[PDB]
Amino acid sequence: KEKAIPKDQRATTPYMTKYERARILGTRALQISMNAPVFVDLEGETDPLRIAMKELAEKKIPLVIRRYLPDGSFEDWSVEELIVDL
Amino acid sequence: MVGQQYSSAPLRTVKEVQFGLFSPEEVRAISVAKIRFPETMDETQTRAKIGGLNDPRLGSIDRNLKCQTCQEGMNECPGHFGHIDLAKPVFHVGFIAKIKKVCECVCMHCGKLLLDEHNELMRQALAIKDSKKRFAAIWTLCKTKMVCETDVPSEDDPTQLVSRGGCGNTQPTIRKDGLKLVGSWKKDRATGDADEPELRVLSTEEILNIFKHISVKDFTSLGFNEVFSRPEWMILTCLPVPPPPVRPSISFNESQRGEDDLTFKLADILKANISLETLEHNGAPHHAIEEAESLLQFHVATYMDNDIAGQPQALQKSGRPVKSIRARLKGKEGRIRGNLMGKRVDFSARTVISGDPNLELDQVGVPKSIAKTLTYPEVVTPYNIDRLTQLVRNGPNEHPGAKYVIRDSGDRIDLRYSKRAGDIQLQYGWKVERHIMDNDPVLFNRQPSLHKMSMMAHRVKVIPYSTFRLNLSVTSPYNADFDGDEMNLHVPQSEETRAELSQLCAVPLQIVS
Amino acid sequence: ALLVDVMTTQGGLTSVTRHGFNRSNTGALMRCSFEETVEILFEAGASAELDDCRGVSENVILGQMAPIGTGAFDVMIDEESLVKY
Amino acid sequence: VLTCPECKVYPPKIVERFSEGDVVCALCGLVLSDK
Amino acid sequence: LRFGEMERDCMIAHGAASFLKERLMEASDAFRVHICGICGLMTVIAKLNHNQFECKGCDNKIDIYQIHIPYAAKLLFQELMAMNITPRLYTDRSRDF
Amino acid sequence: AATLQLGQEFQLKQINHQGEEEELIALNLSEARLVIKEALVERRRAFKRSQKKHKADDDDFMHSETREKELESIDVLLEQTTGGNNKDLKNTMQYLTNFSRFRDQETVGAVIQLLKSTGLHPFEVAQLGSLACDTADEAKTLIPSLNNKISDDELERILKELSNLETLY
Amino acid sequence: MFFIKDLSLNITLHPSFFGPRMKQYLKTKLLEEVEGSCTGKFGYILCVLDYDNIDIQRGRILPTDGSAEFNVKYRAVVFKPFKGEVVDGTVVSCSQHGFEVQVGPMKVFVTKHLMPQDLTFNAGSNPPSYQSSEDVITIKSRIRVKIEGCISQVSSIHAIGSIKEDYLGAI
Amino acid sequence: TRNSLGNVIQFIYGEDGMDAAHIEKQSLDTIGGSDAAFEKRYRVDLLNTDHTLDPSLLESGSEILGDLKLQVLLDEEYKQLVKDRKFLREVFVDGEANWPLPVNIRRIIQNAQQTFHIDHTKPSDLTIKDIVLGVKDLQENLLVLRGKNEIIQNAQRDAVTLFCCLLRSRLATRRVLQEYRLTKQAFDWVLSNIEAQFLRSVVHPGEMVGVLAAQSIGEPATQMTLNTFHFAGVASKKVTSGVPRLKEILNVAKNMK
């Protein structure tokens, strides 16, 4: 647990890349398509990808991204606190 | 979900690949069948001879009988290794140069390095961590000391001589003739004899004995390893025999088995070995023994590499060269560049293109039959069970429809033979392999794929006729026109893959190059 | 700029050939991928060379997920937000 | 010997789908061996 | 259809590891192999009906691992080992042993 | 373990999750049976408390009149705590109950104190708690580790005292 | 032999169980999978201590299937013998080749070559047993067996023991 | 930018850490031109009749004249512009002005003028203090590297130097009040839009830049063959260039033709 960086000493970008966005959407779409509970008010949609986008819009995806520094340490960022461009 | 079986061993991922070399002890311990006969299959011509090249303990490739060692079908048996014992040690065709180089750098009698810590140049060489340069420098330095020094001047005082235990004998000069390593002794001029270097072919067993006498500090200094890479192992004593998976037999009919080249070469190796053995114990003259050893060395050398410089090529009974192991891996069509970096795939199509001005920028017209052949494994959930049920009822001869139904347990029901298009009731977690439907992402490309923008994602639209359809503005990134060009279509088979094709490689996102 | 920096990063001019890149310190399978396969394999065996399986070629040979873009990070579950709902 | 574990009918009726690399029971449609 | 080297390079340029892995292994040739945890070789004999796992050379019946690799990689490793070279597969957490 | 060859997996010094060295813990039939019974009844009490949260009798289980009543209580405990999917646990518990040398906690504590007052190896102590030997030489032969390590008079005294401590059924 | 050890396990939770009650599902999975199992590295898994004090680790969603894998550490009481161990047990079955003794959850077999000749097989007795001058061994008779070897498979461990020397048999 | 072994090839990708598709050609106006044109364009003086602001441009033009703090600020700005001219002429000794850079400031200003229906025939309500402080703060709010020790600070300033030079070149006080005639609302809008469009141009970690660079270099190499022999049209200019020259550069040949 020595690798983990304290929250105050986080020196990575506070925006989320396109790769992280695509990975998160894919994971959430798979979990929804495997009958996982939905955290938002579904309105007439039957596609897991669109419901994943909808959950992302209200920032309700309960996932955490771990970013690997080259030496081996890592930095943990919640999906709620990552700024997503539109 | 690979193997169609269950095992309790945990799944893990490869992290390191530590290379090395077999010791003969390892070849013996690993092997399960000491091959003994130059024949494969019995005199009844119905079963393989036990102890032959096709011993059942190694395994079988056929789909009816199972392996004797593990009792598994041909789709689960990896294959097990045999071994063959050699009468006399044989040089390995891939380390002749290294053997000679390390032979010239070590005394032929006392089995020790010609130098030690006293010399400054040895300190410089031992200061280098790079093994390759270290060995090259040590070779180019110590190739010129033909006599071992018994006493060396002390570093503190050049007038003081300290004995290093050297034997003081005279080392030869070694040259290579074909597969033979011939030495020449240049006797000292003070001996009174002429400066005629006596020539002799060095015996492999003597060289093996010399190498076996080297120590650990010299192990590290030369650039070898104690556990994995000892030099004594560079000379062959026992030859491992690969299982029949590596050399599969192609059977046209019940009694028509065309065997691989590798097994023919191995049979010849064993034949020569038994001939040399039966001449060895019969008290034959030395000339015949030398000739037989040369023949054995030739066969073992050309079994692995068949392109050796300055020798004839081992030919087949029809005149073609024998495809050795090296020729399997070295080519462009060999394993590395033909079966591990690029390979043929499933769920793909290839067809000519055309132009459609009514299609949107990022939409591709897919013919009907190509849409009826490729599929997608959709998961049954509360949101789709009605449409999926109607799709299953439709069958495989109608678009839209389905072609297979996978249960929770991994079993897969072919909808065509099972009358149960109108019978199967679907549950939560089953999978329907349905046709590709409008607005499914696909990957689409043209060869050669020179740059990033030549492989892009698209949304499907099912159309009649046999051509693909494209918008007339994407023909510039593809460098493609419509006078006969064919392009390739690849279908993703998951949700993560579909999201990657829709959020990374889409045509809208590839406009500013 | 990147090509030039790669070509002159070892203190000297390293040509883009086998002599320059296939004699580098990189992984064994990576180097044997092109034009000197069997000899590099022999030398790696004789010297007891250790491969680390971090480059693209080593993760393509072994059929795994290379750390390339979407594969550069790990996705993990946050229990606090899940319980909070 | 290759038999369907659900029909339990002897002798088993089996059809090989070469173009799909499958072995299929001709009664329940079950897929027995692949590739 | 051939998914060549140029295609692999283009997919690396885009940055889609999952598509690459699915195309390479799940769509062409996936294989499951039991490897020994001590010598790191493919010599382990497994009787799956009786779940009997044995390594003859090292006398091992506990440290045995399941790995998912292509089939051409297994062929390459066997052909390498048929010339007295040892490609010794190891696991991340095998340094403890 | 004739020569006390316990291997790495069962070393005398154990490294716990806290990282501190601890003496290896060995329990005989009585200690293990009491521990597992206590754990099972505690789990049953926790389950009942949880059920009451979502929405007296336990004193009779630990105090058993007879072996048969104890076995019936054990069966009820397994039905209400295990689910009946674990036959090996039932067999082990039956073996513990049928051949438990000591039923009361205080007597088991007395046996532990008597065996470990001399400071013998935990393996030997657990073996002596499991085995009832009439003579010191019988135990010494059946426990080769006890040879050369304990005086015969001390072993005879311990065995006689343990035999006296056995509660009549 | 009963011992306390520290164990760990990797458990995969299906995506359909992803809710606020995930800890309960993990606890149920652990209890239902681990208790009563047998591992050749640590013997039979008899019991798990401090059920309320189960240690947990953060999930790591697998990139291939979406099932969340968790690493769970705990302390457990397990049973495993060693070479040369002497254990009391109960006779299960009687045969001419020897006998079988249940000790804990395991079986140790003794072959007729591994007992002194004074013990003779009596088949006419009900049940058939071994009779000697002093010791008689039969069903439900406490018998001490010196375990000589053990064979470990995925789900069980068999043992072979000998009583060839003195002070062995009925107690 | 590193490789599989961890060796650093570049301490920053491209030396400024920008994506290759967020970069357009823009002209640095400080480099070129004679000293008289520079002085007329960028110098403002509140005490000399030669270089005053016409009061019909600034709403508070009457009262500001003769002030002291304002001329100190303008003097600091002019010193900064002079130093920028010296540095930029040190870098590009050829005197060229068009270079690729992020963010098209001209289009942002044109959008501000088109959206707010700015009428040039009326005085503007801006303040010299506000313009200068706003430009300086916007420079303070441009970030590519987010370390905390001095090394990362120096690296980040080195990265953003040239863009700060262009930004100072376009948003000078006289240019704002006399050439654009922006109001306060439009000025705030321009500053916010500039910051937002800059922050979206950084390169995304995880990008495989090696294969991108290799493809970019070697795609035109395929078409280079066609026009290699144009120098073949001059017989007395038999100098190797084209495919053979690139081959010799790559091989590091020790015997050039």
Curated annotation (Swiss-Prot), chain A:
Subcellular location as annotated: Cytoplasm; Nucleus
Family: Belongs to the archaeal Rpo6/eukaryotic RPB6 RNA polymerase subunit family.
Main location: cytoplasm
Protein name according to UniProt: DNA-directed RNA polymerases I, II, and III subunit RPABC2
Gene Ontology annotations of biological process type: nucleolar large rRNA transcription by RNA polymerase I; ribosome biogenesis; RNA-templated transcription; termination of RNA polymerase I transcription; termination of RNA polymerase III transcription; transcription by RNA polymerase I; transcription by RNA polymerase II; transcription by RNA polymerase III
Other information: Present with 6090 molecules/cell in log phase SD medium.
A single cellular component GO annotation: RNA polymerase III complex
Record's subunit section: Component of the RNA polymerase I (Pol I), RNA polymerase II (Pol II) and RNA polymerase III (Pol III) complexes. Component of the RNA polymerase I (Pol I) complex consisting of 14 subunits: RPA135, RPA190, RPC40, RPA14, RPB5, RPO26, RPA43, RPB8, RPA12, RPB10, RPC19, RPC10, RPA49 and RPA34. The complex is composed of a horseshoe-shaped core containing ten subunits (RPA135, RPA190, RPB5, RPO26, RPB8, RPB10, RPC10, RPA12, RPC19 and RPC40) where RPA135 and RPA190 form the DNA-binding cleft.
Swiss-Prot/TrEMBL keywords: Cytoplasm, DNA-directed RNA polymerase, Nucleus, Phosphoprotein, Ribosome biogenesis, Transcription
Disulfide pairings: none
Region spans: Leucine-zipper: 42-63
Full-sequence range covered: 70 to 155 of 155
Domain of life according to the entry: Eukaryota
UniProtKB/Swiss-Prot annotation, chain B:
UniProt PTM: The tandem 7 residues repeats in the C-terminal domain (CTD) can be highly phosphorylated. The phosphorylation activates Pol II. Phosphorylation occurs mainly at residues 'Ser-2' and 'Ser-5' of the heptapeptide repeat. The phosphorylated form of Pol II appears to carry, on average, one phosphate per repeat. The phosphorylation state is believed to result from the balanced action of site-specific CTD kinases and phosphatases, and a 'CTD code' that specifies the position of Pol II within the transcription cycle has been proposed.
Chain positions recorded as Zn(2+) 1 binding sites: 67, 70, 77, 80
The species this protein was found in: Saccharomyces cerevisiae (strain ATCC 204508 / S288c)
UniProt function note: DNA-dependent RNA polymerase catalyzes the transcription of DNA into RNA using the four ribonucleoside triphosphates as substrates. Largest and catalytic component of RNA polymerase II which synthesizes mRNA precursors and many functional non-coding RNAs. Forms the polymerase active center together with the second largest subunit. Pol II is the central component of the basal RNA polymerase II transcription machinery. During a transcription cycle, Pol II, general transcription factors and the Mediator complex assemble as the preinitiation complex (PIC) at the promoter.
Family (UniProt): Belongs to the RNA polymerase beta' chain family.
Region (Rudder loop): 306-323
Binding site for Mg(2+) 1: 481, 483, 485
Span of the signal peptide: none
UniProtKB/Swiss-Prot annotation, chain F:
Signal peptide: none
Any single GO CC term annotated in Swiss-Prot or TrEMBL for this entry: RNA polymerase II, core complex
Known partners and oligomeric status: Component of the RNA polymerase II (Pol II) complex consisting of 12 subunits. RPB4 and RPB7 form a dissociable subcomplex associated with the 10-subunit Pol II core complex. In exponentially proliferating cells, only approximately 20 % of the Pol II complexes contain the RPB4-RPB7 subcomplex. In starving cells, that enter stationary phase, RPB4-RPB7 is associated with Pol II in a stoechiometric manner. The RPB4-RPB7 subcomplex probably associates with TFG1. Interacts with LSM2 and PAT1.
Cited function: DNA-dependent RNA polymerase catalyzes the transcription of DNA into RNA using the four ribonucleoside triphosphates as substrates. Component of RNA polymerase II which synthesizes mRNA precursors and many functional non-coding RNAs. Pol II is the central component of the basal RNA polymerase II transcription machinery. It is composed of mobile elements that move relative to each other. RPB4 is part of a subcomplex with RPB7 that binds to a pocket formed by RPB1, RPB2 and RPB6 at the base of the clamp element.
Coiled-coil segments on the chain, per record: none
Alphabetized GO MF terms: nucleotide binding; translation initiation factor binding
Family: Belongs to the eukaryotic RPB4 RNA polymerase subunit family.
Gene expressing this chain: RPB4
Origin: domain of life: Eukaryota
Record's keyword annotation contains Phosphoprotein: yes
This protein's name: DNA-directed RNA polymerase II subunit RPB4
Ranges of biased composition (kind: Basic residues): 48-55
UniProtKB/Swiss-Prot annotation, chain G:
Primary subcellular site in the record, as a coarse category: nucleus
Keyword Cytoplasm included in the entry's annotation: yes
InterPro entries cross-referenced by the UniProt entry: NA-bd_OB-fold, RNA_pol_Rpb7-like_N_sf, Rpb7-like, Rpb7-like_N, S1_domain
Compartments (UniProt record): Nucleus; Cytoplasm; Cytoplasm, P-body
UniProt GO cellular component terms: cytoplasm; nucleus; P-body; RNA polymerase II, core complex; RPB4-RPB7 complex
SUPFAM superfamilies membership: N-terminal, heterodimerisation domain of RBP7 (RpoE), Nucleic acid-binding proteins
Biological function: DNA-dependent RNA polymerase catalyzes the transcription of DNA into RNA using the four ribonucleoside triphosphates as substrates. Component of RNA polymerase II which synthesizes mRNA precursors and many functional non-coding RNAs. Pol II is the central component of the basal RNA polymerase II transcription machinery. It is composed of mobile elements that move relative to each other. RPB7 is part of a subcomplex with RPB4 that binds to a pocket formed by RPB1, RPB2 and RPB6 at the base of the clamp element.
Family, per entry: Belongs to the eukaryotic RPB7/RPC8 RNA polymerase subunit family.
Protein name from the UniProt record: DNA-directed RNA polymerase II subunit RPB7
Organism: Saccharomyces cerevisiae (strain ATCC 204508 / S288c)
